[PDB]
Amino acid sequence: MRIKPDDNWRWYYDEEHDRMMLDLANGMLFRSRFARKMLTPDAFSPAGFCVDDAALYFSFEEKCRDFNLSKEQKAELVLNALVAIRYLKPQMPKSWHFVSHGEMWVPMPGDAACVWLSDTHEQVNLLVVESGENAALCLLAQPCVVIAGRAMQLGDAIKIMNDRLKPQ
Amino acid sequence: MRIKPDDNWRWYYDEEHDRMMLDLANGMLFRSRFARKMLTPDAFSPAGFCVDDAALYFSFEEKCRDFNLSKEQKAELVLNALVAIRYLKPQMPKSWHFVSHGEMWVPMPGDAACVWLSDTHEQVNLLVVESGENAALCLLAQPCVVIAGRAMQLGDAIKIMNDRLKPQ
After folding, report:
1. Which of A23, A59, A162, B101 is 20 to 30 A from residue A76's alpha carbon, by CA?
2. Are residues A86 and A38 in the same domain?
3. Does B79 touch chain A (CB under 8 A)?
4. Is residue B41 located within the same domain as residue B70?
5. The last residue of a domain, from among B90, B121, B150
6. Three-class secondary structure assignment of chain B
């Protein structure tokens, strides 16, 4: 495997570029997708990467093996998922942008999900990171997409309603 | 191999942390050893990692395979070499901190070199990154050392006189 979690990793908030980061260490850094706006007040205090984060990392890594992405992309995808799980504030679920399915499906963390955009009918691929019973928090699991007016790229968060999500 | 140069790599200087970086991309960043003080005015303008850089990367990587280091440390070593070659200002060669050898040897870029410290006789490993006929730019190729009063760690530049350098 390409990157392997190590005792030396540190989460820290970068004041100047306004983004959660991981120190890798050894000259390497990972700048996540998430800025102050989206972090819980935990985030603002450096913390070691712990066994629990290691564990989530290993599961996510395997759950993503078969997504259609560069192994560099899979890494960024899984590292943002840890940031989201650990530090993201609660999200306001989105509904009406996506083709609705008459049944609700229970989606588990680590699942590959599609939604359909209700105007373009373009399929978009997500990774599920957190469940709920109405809403599921997902990360965008493809290089980019345009949603409301907004553009988003790989790693970006969005809470979607379970009736809009579907297995790949 | 693990890190592979990619069209999306960008050199840029980071105003806020005063260091030359490389964007890797995919969330990954590399922070080199080198601050404003040591850069040619080129540095202050972002630039794609180009085919020539890619070439230097590949020879330096191979010339460092058998150094006594972590593959993470070899990565940091080589990346700093690239910064050094591309962007470092001319250096003032040092002389007197190192055990002299009555003959001058010709050292090629890419070479593994030792200097001896003249008071401790401790051996220190370097990586040659530029040649000249008197002076040869080297990066420190071991985790850390103490030289004049200064500390230095892996990736740090110093220009040394060729009579002071010796092959591994």
Report:
1. A162
2. yes
3. yes
4. yes
5. B90
6. CCCCCCCCCEEEEECCCCEEEEECCCCEEEECCCCHHHECHHHHCCEECCHHHHHHHHHHHHHCCCCCCCHHHHHHHHHHHHHHHHHECCCCCECCCECCCCCCCCCCCCCEEEEEECCCCCEEEEEEEECCCCEEEEEECCCEEECCCCEEECCCEEEEECCCCEEC
